[PDB]
């Protein structure tokens, strides 16, 4: 129930640069077990509480984990324009989701 997700919002970047995607679960003491980073079509990363960061091989060239629970995109294409999602797997509350819209311009 009680707890929200704040994000970096709707942002914009030049082609070829980097962006940081950050999220922050707040207003709850429930423990974060996993966080997934996803595009509208593909999952990009998973930070596990036990086992750590895995990065989807479709983005190994261009995606560093963090800082913190965020994620850094490296060589943005206009193809990267769209929605992004940090999904918070949590106990006891459940799945919290924050959303970011990115637009890569030329």
């Amino acid at each position, epitope marked *: 129930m009680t707890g929200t997700i704040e994000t970096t919002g709707n942002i914009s970047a030049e082609k070829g640069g980097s962006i940081i995607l950050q999220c922050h679960l707040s207003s709850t003491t429930a423990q974060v077990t*996993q966080v997934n980073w996803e595009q509208q*079509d*593909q*999952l990009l990363a*998973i930070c*596990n509480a*036990d*086992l*750590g960061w*895995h990065i*989807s*091989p*479709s983005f*190994k060239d261009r995606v560093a984990p963090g800082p913190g629970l965020g994620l850094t995109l490296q060589s943005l294409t206009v193809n990267d324009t769209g929605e992004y999602f940090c999904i918070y797997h949590t106990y006891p509350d459940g799945t919290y989701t924050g959303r970011i819209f990115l637009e890569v311009l030329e």
Partner: antibody, heavy 119, light 108 residues
Framework: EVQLVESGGGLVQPGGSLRLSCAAS????????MYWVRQAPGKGLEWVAY????????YYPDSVKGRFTISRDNAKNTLYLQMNSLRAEDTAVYYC????????????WGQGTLVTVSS | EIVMTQSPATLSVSPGERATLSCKAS??????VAWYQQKPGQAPRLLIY???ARHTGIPARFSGSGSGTEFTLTISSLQSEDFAVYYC?????????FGGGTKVEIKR
């Protein structure tokens, strides 16, 4: 119980074309990323095709790139492999596989269907 | 591409005993390494993901170790049913690549 059924295997002449089918059940086929993997008789396993949950992105190894085409129809609960310009060394049992939605690999494989490329 | 080499090719093990399998990646694959059991005539069955995490439905006598380039699957008290060819696989990057396998026979 997750179920994957492959279909379409048989003899085809070199240079020809064939099309394979995987029929899913027991899981929301549309949420899951899908693979094809192949295995020559007596030899090992070779990744051949990857596709996104909605079909937007596809990834192939150099071995088959530009000849195989992975695809899905989400309402048919079906994944397809279109094998063009076939070669002799393409002969293998072909498996479709489902990706873990908690990691980036394969949890469940079908039983396979066997392709044979010979004159 | 990332070559995964398993060793040894073959291992005969008395029942109740421990087999130890080895997968060696040609470059750092992190902990993106999975282990698969393929019984003759059967599809591969997933045993370990994330180099150490055991897939549900897998007995705890299977156990996965390693990070970096050196990975290790361990079957701590073999049973007749555990006879299969076991496969390792890295998913750090494309192309996803598999080991050559290690066949394991039951001793009697």
């Amino acid at each position: 119980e997750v179920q994957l059924v492959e279909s379409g295997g048989g003899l085809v002449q070199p240079g020809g074309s064939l099309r394979l089918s995987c029929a899913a059940s027991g899981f929301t086929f549309s949420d899951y990323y899908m693979y094809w993997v192949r295995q020559a008789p007596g030899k090992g396993l070779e990744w051949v095709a990857y596709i996104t949950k909605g079909g937007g992105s596809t990834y192939y190894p150099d071995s088959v790139k530009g000849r195989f085409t992975i695809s899905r129809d989400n309402a048919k609960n079906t994944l397809y492999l279109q094998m063009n310009s076939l070669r002799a060394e393409d002969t293998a049992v072909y498996y479709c596989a489902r990706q873990t939605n908690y990691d980036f690999t394969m949890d469940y494989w079908g039983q396979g269907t066997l392709v044979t490329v010979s004159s | 591409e990332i070559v995964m080499t398993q060793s040894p090719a073959t291992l005969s093990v008395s029942p109740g005993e421990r087999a130890t399998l080895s997968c060696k990646a040609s470059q750092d694959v992190g902990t993106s390494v999975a282990w698969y059991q393929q019984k003759p005539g059967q599809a591969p069955r997933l045993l370990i993901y994330w180099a150490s995490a055991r897939h549900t439905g897998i007995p705890a006598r299977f156990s996965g170790s390693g990070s970096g380039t050196e990975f290790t699957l361990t079957i701590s008290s073999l049973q007749s049913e555990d006879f299969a060819v076991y496969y390792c696989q890295q998913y750090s990057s494309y192309p996803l690549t598999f080991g050559g396998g290690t066949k394991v026979e039951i001793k009697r």
